Design an enzyme around this catalytic site. Structure first.
Site, PDB file in Angstrom:
ATOM      1  N   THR A   1     -11.877  78.455 -42.040  1.00 40.92           N
ATOM      2  CA  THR A   1     -10.706  79.146 -41.513  1.00 40.92           C
ATOM      3  C   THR A   1     -10.178  78.472 -40.256  1.00 40.92           C
ATOM      4  OG1 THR A   1     -12.108  80.701 -40.292  1.00 40.92           O
ATOM      5  CG2 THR A   1     -11.420  81.325 -42.517  1.00 40.92           C
ATOM      6  N   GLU A   2     -11.062  78.127 -39.321  1.00 40.50           N
ATOM      7  CA  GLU A   2     -10.603  77.697 -38.008  1.00 40.50           C
ATOM      8  C   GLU A   2      -9.982  76.310 -38.065  1.00 40.50           C
ATOM      9  OE1 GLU A   2     -10.515  79.441 -35.205  1.00 40.50           O
ATOM     10  OE2 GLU A   2     -11.361  81.225 -36.153  1.00 40.50           O
ATOM     11  N   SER A   3     -10.622  75.375 -38.766  1.00 34.60           N
ATOM     12  CA  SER A   3     -10.203  73.986 -38.683  1.00 34.60           C
ATOM     13  C   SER A   3      -9.991  73.300 -40.018  1.00 34.60           C
ATOM     14  CB  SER A   3     -11.229  73.174 -37.884  1.00 34.60           C
ATOM     15  OG  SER A   3     -10.862  71.815 -37.807  1.00 34.60           O
TER      16      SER A   3
ATOM     17  N   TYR B   1      -8.904  87.857 -41.515  1.00 34.63           N
ATOM     18  CA  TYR B   1     -10.082  87.034 -41.261  1.00 34.63           C
ATOM     19  C   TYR B   1     -11.331  87.661 -41.872  1.00 34.63           C
ATOM     20  CZ  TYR B   1     -12.348  83.464 -38.262  1.00 34.63           C
ATOM     21  OH  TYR B   1     -13.008  82.364 -37.772  1.00 34.63           O
TER      22      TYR B   1
ATOM     23  N   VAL C   1     -16.375  79.946 -41.288  1.00 41.40           N
ATOM     24  CA  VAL C   1     -15.669  79.927 -40.013  1.00 41.40           C
ATOM     25  C   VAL C   1     -15.046  78.559 -39.790  1.00 41.40           C
ATOM     26  CG1 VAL C   1     -16.048  79.870 -37.539  1.00 41.40           C
ATOM     27  CG2 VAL C   1     -16.851  81.810 -38.864  1.00 41.40           C
TER      28      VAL C   1
END
Lengths: 124, 1223, 81, 329, 83, 124
Positions: free
Chosen positions: B29-31, B131, B26
């Protein structure tokens, strides 16, 4: 016994019902064990390590290896899974025949070594 | 791969139980691993959320930076809690939770979650579907297959990808196309699942219910079948199982094996997990191997096993059954592996290496139980023997490697810890670790040297201190007193007996449900500390005694009686011969049991980091004054002392305050009263023999009451004190026994005797003979006061001498002792073989005789130095380390700052499943990993390299500020020397341990070790790439543990019974022995490089073999939580390492004895000797004392449970062994 | 934060060392002085249960009796919404 | 499943021997993800410290479930009866929402994971703080605010912030000065910041500063009056809970519970307390106390002995020039 | 008490110092128990403590919510029936 | 089993009596389980969720759903209730399907979530 020591999950409840029923009807614990073993052997294939003893790498339910609707075609999935086991052994030398474990989750077959580094998931 | 947040992600996963892979990917993907990520939408954070999540659940009770800012630890913790809630809400569906996280919920999220629920991935948005496709590997989902149906894979055969995809219709290409690598294995989710009854720490009410209602509490540990709903059902099931197993033991495996374990060819490998079997009905009388077989014993000695602890012959039977199972199984393993190897190379013989010892062990045990004619005895004809290690002759057998035969024909195999050949060879080739010790001289040598050569003062002092065994003088009235030597021997014997009593009592105490049954509350070392502390506090405040369980009550009574007796001997040292002996005890008229006051170095360091010097001093003084004003007896005794000291009829409060401040100055500004083992290690000059620290730490106040410090926290002087009577009782005993001997022999104190000896040196500074005499006298005083240092090697040589004596006189005890040492040798040699096979670094580099590379040598230097530095700077108190490790978690900090209810650390502690489940193995691995990390950081700092632990996140996992890390670098630069080779040294040693930054260094190393090495549930090779020699060795040990947990036998055992405790015991034994062997190998390679080039091959071939590595493992491998040390349980008198008329005199002595010990039968369980018993005790150790000491000492090495021996055996079988080669 | 840690790391008062008494703490002056000033979570929870022991009856039978009395009596039911 | 199964306690026998004992409400369904291991050593079980906890709690829970389900049935039946008069009238159950959420909470508590009674807090601005507890009003249920984690406290829940705030705002003559004047945190900031010698001296003795720019390194090595007061409150409160359990046991003995009612409950309490006090003053009377009254007397005696010991030696705290406020030693 | 009255008499002029001495006087009133916390502190204290439990002790938090909701049900049923 | 678990509780006593009767008639508790289970199946309809693992949202007795005098009108009542559940979910997407629960009281059918938001009464 490989089928009873490593009894897969759903066959646990089916086998408990069979064992209880035969024990109730006959009283004989040997008859119940023979019936429950017979059920497990008919309903599972025990993958064995092709060694002197790499035996019982896993007991997979027969319906999880089944391809297409034909019940007898579980053998095709068995051949695929055994080829997968051989390919995993051959590809990674440090894994030996005793390292692999075959076990089934709810809807998947997992083929992994003793470590967690290698896991491949085979689903219906 | 790592990006400076692995510690935080791992912590936030263990807390808020959730996949670490989920949280990490996570983050991916996010940051893509940036704490503040610029996004056009508006989210700005590590997890990229502003939205309503942020303020949402977390925060709002604290100054929240929030929408603008988030603390990365807090952000990761909140995101992890959110993901754990989503994962749990969606049953276990990892991917549904990921979809809910990314696509939100409510507005656009909920329709997509419903579509996911009905299959229907078409309705799911493209972003969310992508995702989930990203997370397919790390996420466990029932819907994973449906998503896959709706490539960096190792080739099965031929070329990669296109060859197997575009083509290869033949099965193998099919199996490749259905692969789907999982790479999401969590050992505690898949292999070792925490049950309800595991990981559940009892409330006091449940504890009392368990203590009252459960016959054998170990049966609480098993959970067969479905979990009982409530503790009453668990108790009922436990009792039913216990009665069934007790009923079954008579026809159980013990009875079946009581006839012919190895003569019948029993294979323990094809066995059920032996859960109920405790080896109670196991007397191995093999029919055959029984020739002549007298029913009456020859002497009153022999007859039975001469142990003096209750439960003997039963725990011995358990150890024997476990050892027989293990050895027979290891023989079977050896044969099977030899057959498998002969498949490859038919003309290769190999060696079983177990079956000879096991056959002889069955023969010995059979003759022992049948009382006659040991058939394991060799035919000693045509044997010249010759070769004496400590006066024990032996013949080397060509047939068996090592494995000498003794005078009576008894053959001790190689790796038997006591056989003279292995002991001698270990002495000759021992890595840097061989030191001065006690080889300087012994009491017999000083007696001859000084007691008889033309000097009034020299001979006077010698006659006072040393007794002459045989002399030409033979004084008819030389001395009617005890002499210092005899007092020293007597005190050693009585201390050793009370140590064995304490050992038994503490084992019983720490087997109770509070520490053994439920989820693992504390490590074994910490349970030992808690019990010792409870006993000591109950001694000081008798009101606490009603809170002790009966076992802890026995422990406290033993400790109280011991300390009361020591005080009684120090107050009246004239109970021995000397009438002009007066009260070495510092402050009498203070009538109460004196538990020695020793203060933790690191507790003081903690109370100095805040409130540096005057703050801690005045806190100590104020707590003492709280005691003074609170209790009238304290006031009375302090006032009496102050009146006597100042010669004033009235005492002003100013006087008592100044006295308390002066006494607190010693604790606050000096480490005289701390642990301070290192300064005692130095012996030159006789400086510190004066001023016993244990006696000077004595004060008239009570350390019990606490004072509130200016920051509001409460500090009691008892918080500084070090309990645990593991380093404390032995050291106190050494010093006080030295002082007692000095005053009981000579009227003079330690200071007066030392001054007299220095005066004698100044007088006879000329003559070489007289200088040698005064030096022998000085060596006597140094031995007597305990400066000395006997080393670890004395246990096995003392055992060899005592077992030789037993062979002369006590046959049954002799054979039982040989059996227990043979079992210990087989256990350790099986461990060495299996771990030499399994753990790579061992076989490739360290167990191999081939010298290591220069870079590997530098790594070894770094790792051994890290171990040394850890021994220097590690907190000794187990409470301190446990609280330091637990408190750094986010839960304790947030509760301390924001919470309105107090809570407590070890309730809000996250705790890895490695600690909750399999605690002992984790403790060993944490210690080794921390030492390796210390060595790695020190080596990197001296070499100038910046570690991957420099970056902010891993420091944030600990309390290492940017600043404290720079301070750590400065400290390492100031006190560590970079050698010309990889060798590392310390400047001033003690001064380095003095630095406050050393605590920060240790904390950094420990937290980094935990978070990076032990906390993760995954072992990979890339993980071992990062760390140095010790680091990768401990990582391969962790991998070995995970492999064993996945072994078929261990998986089946856990599924059938759960019982994490038994697996923990087994793996703990494995890890202890293996780490001992690995450390030995590293030190041996270092010493080999210390030698000239030609001798390195011979030395490594001689020093790196299974026998010496196994003896090193038996030598060290110190159990972490062992009540008392193996040296204390069996250790000879330090000075005492080694015609008919005198016989007739000794006869005339023993004709007349009328002491209570002779008149009365010995107490069952606790001698509880007083001063009269100590004075009337013989100076020579009796045979039952040695035998009980041997059994207690081996209780750590040789497990009493047959089940753990079987588990160790099956772990080895799944692992594999080496088989030696050729002959 | 780190100061409060350095405080709670060291605690060796008997309340920390010993398991809590079942049914009565019977604190003496040493226990009162060594007690933390902030109320702990078990203290609050036991206080809550004891305090509600008056409002919420421990007997299911009296709750059923109250319920049947109310049934024989009636209920208002609010209105609308 | 008390309420997932539609159990109607109204059609029940008088239920006499039932004391609540084997009542762990784990409703199958309402149990999603369900960990067997607790996250912390905190949590795990109900953290009460009185003996018999988890059992009297179970009895209270079973009684409350029976009562709430029955009251839901009563409200539904009365609504049906009123709909007979006027079909165009809905009414509110006012019990079944709270009872459904109570079943969900108890189910997750006993199954250890995933409370399904929890709201979806998305698109909620919260705001509205009674004592630092944020909440959202639910339009769907009268009163009945929702907390930060999604926990919804119904109206008439004694702790929910909106009822507490409204009760404070409109409380009949009975609203008084109380303790609203000031608190220790405000006192420290106001007076320990004086820059005066006597004011700051007295403040240092009495009040402790939570956070201040002064941050005295050696401001005071004493307990201080505020910390003593709070410590004594905590110890007294623990003793009160101990006494409460002891006295409950004492007044549950046959003398006051079984036969014809000899005295009122208030008088049973008075008689037990008086017996304990007289036995304390005259130890000869202690042989006449039942074991439960003996425990009561031991608790009371220990409390008063400890208080006396603190009065006699008020220097057990930091100050050494503290001397025996106790009147007649 | 005598010292605080003396300080008040000394600083009878300054408004700030009168506020300070009145704060000290209120401190003594709280400390000696004059105060009077009222019945309402029970439920507000319970609300604060239950919020804290929700942060840290899950099972205790849920049990506290359950017992408080049961109390609310009992009292609201009583209000309805007796109304 | 969906019928034996949950259970409408209007049939709890009838199922008790049937289980006792079959156990006493034929001394076989397996037969008693089978008979009382089949009684509950014939007398009740199990509502199931829309998901792939579709679990039981509720079990409502068959007679309570009848719209007209035909005993088979419970089919039309069932269709109405399935449509009602779909409408409740569609109007309030907040409710995950697991929250929504269906049960029968003495006279009426309630479908409601595990929260006080949604509670819909359906009388015969």
């Amino acid at each position: 016994a490989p089928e009873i020591a490593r009894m897969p999950a759903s066959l646990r409840e089916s086998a408990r019902k069979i064992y209880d029923s035969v024990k109730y009807r006959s009283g004989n614990e040997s008859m119940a064990m023979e019936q429950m073993t017979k059920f497990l052997k008919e309903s599972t294939y025990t993958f064995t390590g092709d060694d002197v003893d790499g035996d019982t790498v896993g007991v997979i339910p027969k319906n999880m290896m089944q391809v297409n609707s034909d019940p007898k075609s579980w053998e095709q999935g068995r051949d695929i899974l055994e080829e997968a086991r051989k390919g995993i052994i051959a590809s990674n030398p440090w894994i030996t025949n005793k390292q692999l474990t075959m076990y089934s989750q709810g809807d998947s077959i997992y083929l992994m070594d003793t470590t967690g580094q290698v896991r491949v998931r085979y689903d219906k | 791969v790592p990006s400076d947040y692995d510690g935080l992600f791992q912590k936030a996963a263990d807390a808020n139980g959730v996949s670490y892979d989920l949280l990490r990917k996570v983050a991916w993907t996010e940051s893509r691993f940036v704490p503040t990520a610029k996004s056009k939408t508006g989210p700005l954070g590590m997890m990229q959320f502003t939205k309503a999540t942020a303020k949402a659940l977390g925060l709002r009770v604290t100054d929240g930076p929030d929408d603008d800012r988030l603390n990365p630890e807090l952000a990761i913790n909140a995101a992890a809690k959110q993901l754990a809630g989503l994962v749990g809400k969606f049953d276990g569906d990892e991917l549904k939770a990921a979809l809910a996280y990314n696509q939100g919920e409510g507005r656009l999220g909920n329709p997509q979650l419903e579509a996911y629920s009905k299959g229907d991935f078409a309705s799911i948005s493209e972003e969310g579907r992508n995702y989930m496709r990203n997370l397919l590997d790390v996420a466990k989902s029932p819907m994973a297959g449906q998503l896959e149906t709706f490539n960096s894979r190792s080739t099965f055969f031929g070329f990669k990808n296109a060859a197997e995809a575009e083509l290869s219709n033949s099965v193998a290409g099919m199996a490749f196309r259905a692969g789907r690598l999982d790479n999401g294995f969590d050992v505690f989710k898949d292999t070792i699942t925490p049950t309800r009854w595991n990981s559940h720490i009892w409330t006091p009410e449940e504890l009392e219910k368990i203590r009252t209602e459960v016959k054998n509490p170990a049966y609480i540990n098993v959970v067969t079948g479905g979990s009982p709903e409530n503790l009453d059902d668990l108790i009922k099931l436990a009792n039913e199982n216990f009665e069934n197993d007790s009923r079954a033991a008579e026809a159980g495996l013990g009875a079946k094996l009581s006839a012919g374990i190895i003569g019948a060819g029993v294979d323990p490998l094809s066995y059920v997990p032996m859960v109920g079997v405790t080896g109670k009905g196991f007397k191995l009388i093999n029919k055959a191997l029984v020739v002549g077989a007298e029913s009456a014993a020859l002497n009153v000695a022999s007859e039975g096993l001469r142990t003096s602890v209750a439960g003997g012959d039963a725990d011995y039977a358990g150890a024997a059954l476990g050892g027989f199972v293990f050895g027979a199984g290891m023989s079977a393993i050896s044969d099977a592996v030899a057959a498998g190897l002969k498949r490859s190379k038919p003309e290769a013989e190999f060696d079983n290496e177990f079956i000879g010892p096991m056959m002889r062990l069955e023969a010995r045990e059979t003759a022992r139980n049948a009382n006659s004619a040991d058939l394991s005895r060799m035919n000693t004809e045509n044997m010249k023997f010759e070769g004496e290690h400590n006066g024990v002759p032996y013949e080397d057998l060509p047939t068996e490697r090592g494995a000498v035969v003794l005078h009576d024909g008894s053959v001790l195999s190689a790796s038997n810890p006591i056989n003279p050949k292995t002991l001698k060879e270990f002495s000759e080739v021992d890595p840097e670790k061989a030191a001065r010790g006690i080889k300087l001289a012994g009491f017999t040598e000083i007696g001859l040297k000084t007691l008889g050569s033309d000097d009034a003062d020299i001979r006077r002092v010698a006659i006072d201190l040393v007794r002459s065994p045989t002399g030409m003088q033979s004084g008819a009235s030389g001395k009617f007193g005890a002499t210092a030597s005899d007092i020293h021997e007597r005190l050693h014997g009585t201390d050793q007996r009370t140590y064995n009593d304490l050992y038994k009592a503490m084992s019983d105490a720490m087997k109770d449900p509070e520490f053994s049954t439920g989820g693992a509350k504390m490590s074994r070392e910490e349970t030992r500390y808690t019990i010792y502390r409870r006993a000591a506090l109950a001694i000081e405040r008798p009101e606490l005694q009603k809170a002790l369980t009966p076992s802890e009550r026995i422990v406290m009574d033993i400790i109280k009686r011991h300390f009361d007796t020591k005080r009684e001997l120090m107050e009246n040292p004239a109970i021995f011969g000397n009438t002009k002996a007066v009260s070495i005890f510092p402050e009498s008229r203070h009538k109460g049991t004196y538990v020695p006051h020793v203060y933790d170095r690191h507790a003081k360091a903690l109370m100095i980091q805040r409130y540096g010097a005057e703050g801690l001093q005045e806190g100590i003084a104020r707590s003492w004054m709280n005691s003074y004003v609170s209790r009238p007896e304290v006031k009375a005794r302090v006032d009496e002392m102050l009146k006597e000291l100042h010669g004033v009829k009235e005492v002003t409060p100013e006087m008592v305050e100044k006295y308390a401040m002066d006494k607190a100055y010693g604790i606050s500004h000096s480490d005289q009263f701390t642990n301070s083992s290192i300064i005692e290690e130095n012996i030159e000059g006789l400086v510190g023999i004066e001023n016993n620290s244990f006696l000077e730490a004595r004060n008239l106040f009570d350390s019990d009451l606490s004072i509130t410090m200016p920051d509001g926290q409460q500090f009691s002087v008892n918080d500084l004190r070090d309990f645990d009577m593991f380093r404390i009782m032995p050291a106190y005993d050494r010093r006080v026994n030295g002082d007692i001997a000095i005053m009981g022999s000579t009227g003079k104190t330690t200071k007066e005797l030392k001054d007299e000896i220095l005066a004698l040196k100044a007088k006879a500074e000329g003559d070489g003979k007289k200088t040698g005499e005064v030096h022998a006298l000085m060596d006597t005083v140094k031995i007597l006061t305990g400066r000395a240092r006997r080393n670890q090697d004395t246990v096995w040589e003392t055992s060899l001498r005592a077992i030789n004596d037993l062979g002369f006189f006590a046959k049954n005890a002799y054979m039982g002792a040989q059996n227990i040492t043979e079992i210990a040798g087989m256990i350790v040699t099986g461990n060495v073989r299996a771990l030499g096979h399994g753990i790579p670094i061992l076989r490739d580099t360290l167990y191999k005789s081939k010298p290591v590379s220069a870079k590997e040598l530098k790594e070894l230097h770094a790792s051994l130095f890290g171990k040394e530095v850890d021994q220097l700077i590690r907190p000794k108190r187990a409470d301190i380390v446990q609280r330091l490790r637990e408190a750094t978690d986010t839960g304790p900090a947030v509760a301390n700052i924001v919470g309105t209810l107090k809570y407590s650390t070890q309730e809000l502690a996250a705790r890895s499943p490695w600690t909750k489940l399999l605690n002992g193995t984790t403790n060993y691995l944490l210690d080794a990993a921390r030492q390796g990390m210390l060595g790695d950081v020190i080596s990197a700092t001296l070499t100038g390299k910046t570690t991957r632990w420099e970056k902010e996140g891993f420091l944030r996992g600990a309390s290492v500020t940017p600043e404290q890390m720079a301070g750590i670098k400065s400290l390492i630069k100031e006190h560590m020397v970079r050698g010309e080779d990889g060798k590392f040294t310390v400047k001033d040693k003690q001064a380095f341990s003095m630095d406050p930054r050393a605590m920060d260094l240790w904390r950094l190393a420990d937290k980094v070790a935990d978070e990076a090495m032990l906390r993760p549930h995954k072992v990979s090779l890339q993980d071992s790439h990062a760390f140095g020699a010790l680091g990768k060795m401990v990582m391969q040990f962790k991998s070995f543990t995970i492999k064993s947990l996945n072994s078929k036998f261990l998986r089946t055992f856990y599924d059938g019974y759960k019982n994490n405790r038994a697996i923990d015991a087994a793996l703990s034994i494995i890890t202890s022995m293996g780490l001992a062997g690995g450390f030995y190998a590293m030190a041996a390679h270092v010493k080999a490089y210390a030698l000239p080039k030609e001798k390195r091959k011979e030395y490594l071939e001689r020093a790196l073999d299974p026998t010496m590595i196994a003896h090193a493992a038996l030598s060290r491998s110190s159990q972490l939580g062992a009540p008392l040390a193996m040296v204390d349980l069996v250790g000879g008198v330090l000075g005492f390492e080694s015609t008919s008329r005198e016989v007739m005199g000794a006869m005339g002595s023993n004709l007349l004895e009328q002491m209570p010990s002779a008149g009365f039968v010995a107490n069952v369980g606790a001698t509880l000797m007083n001063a009269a018993g100590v004075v009337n005790s013989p100076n020579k150790a009796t045979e039952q004392d040695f035998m009980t000491g041997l059994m207690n000492s081996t209780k750590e090495l040789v497990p009493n449970d047959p089940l753990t021996q079987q588990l160790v055996l099956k772990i080895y079988e799944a692992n594999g062994v080496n088989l030696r080669e050729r002959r």
